[PDB]
Write a protein that binds this ligand. Structure first.
Ligand SMILES: Nc1ncnc2c1ncn2[C@@H]1O[C@H](COP(=O)(O)O)[C@@H](OP(=O)(O)O)[C@H]1O
Ligand SMILES: O=[N+]([O-])c1ccc(O)cc1
Length: 288
């Protein structure tokens, strides 16, 4: 187990995900599809539960029909002893919610041609790094992360699954110039969920009562999503995700990275960050 990363068109991927690209090549997008796109650990599950609730008219019992990773087919997903994304996509009724972490260089062209609405979620790089480090441990398909300091170095050169975080957030940010993309921030959602949920509702064209919006706010909170077995990823085989080493719903906080980053690491990171994000109108908040 724990295979090394396999590169494809310049993007380092989990071997299985790489294999999954093959059958994924036949995927055909519907005009009414909606794509959830994120760099790993940026709130994919969060916004997935929000969107599903919306899609179910706020009905909490419909959202319980199956695990979040079944309700929302993970495009490039593949792992032993469990249906692949595409396999799940076959039993997924429209309108469909889709998930991916694929950079534009690997994104199925059909999605751009069909002008599929996109809800992109971005999170500050430091929290992404920490969250992603613990995820490497608990998601057994990933390679050995090693020490934090070592993983951090990888993360900075984009030598982790799905490549550079700096490229990812920037390329999709630029795409929203010519493609219908709702660009959201994990920090914003954490700050005022109801506000970001209203945004999403508008973007998807739907409309729900004030009372229902508050209802979704409650059940999209870290607390409820941590309790909820249809979103906390606890129903996935232990060989793919072992929560004993670190739970999927880990902390759910913005700014928690301060308890992991050493002062030296922070300074080295802030300097590098400055270069890479030089000439970019993106503005991230490392804390609330
Ligand atoms: N409802 C929620 N509110 C805030 N954060 C949430 C959340 N649900 C999940 N998260 C956090 O989102 C991150 C995972 O995102 P993703 O779905 O893209 O993999 C994890 O962060 P942490 O590891 O900092 O706790 C997880 O705890
Ligand atoms: O390895 N995994 O099981 C994963 C990896 C990434 C992700 O967004 C969800 C699950």
């Amino acid at each position: 187990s724990r295979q090394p990363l396999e590169y494809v068109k310049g993007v380092p991927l989990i071997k299985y995900f790489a294999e999954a690209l093959g059958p994924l090549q036949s995927f055909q997008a519907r005009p009414d599809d909606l794509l959830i796109s994120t760099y790993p650990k940026s709130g994919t599950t969060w916004v997935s539960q929000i969107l599903d609730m919306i899609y179910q008219g706020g009905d909490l019992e419909k959202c319980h029909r199956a695990p979040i990773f079944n309700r929302v087919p993970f495009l490039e997903f593949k792992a032993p002893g469990i249906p692949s994304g595409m396999e799940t996509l076959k039993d997924t009724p429209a309108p469909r919610l889709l998930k991916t972490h694929l950079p534009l260089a690997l994104l199925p062209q059909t999605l751009l041609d069909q002008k599929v609405k996109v809800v992109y979620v971005a999170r500050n790089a430091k929290d992404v790094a920490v969250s992603y480090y613990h995820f490497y441990h608990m998601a057994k398909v990933h390679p050995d992360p090693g020490t934090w300091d070592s993983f951090l170095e990888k993360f900075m050169v984009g030598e982790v699954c799905y490549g550079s975080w700096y490229q990812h957030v920037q390329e999709w940010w630029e795409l929203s110039r010519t493609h219908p993309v709702l660009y959201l921030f994990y920090e914003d959602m954490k700050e005022n969920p109801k506000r970001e949920i209203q945004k999403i509702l508008e973007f998807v064209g739907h409309s729900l009562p004030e009372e229902t919006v508050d209802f979704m706010v409650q059940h999209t909170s870290f607390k409820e999503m941590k309790k909820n077995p249809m979103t906390n990823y606890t129903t996935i085989p232990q060989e793919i995700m072992d929560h004993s080493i670190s739970p999927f719903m880990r902390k759910g906080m913005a700014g928690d990275w301060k308890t992991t980053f050493t002062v030296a690491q922070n300074e080295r990171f802030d300097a590098d960050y400055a270069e890479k994000m030089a000439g970019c109108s993106l503005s991230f908040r490392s804390e609330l």
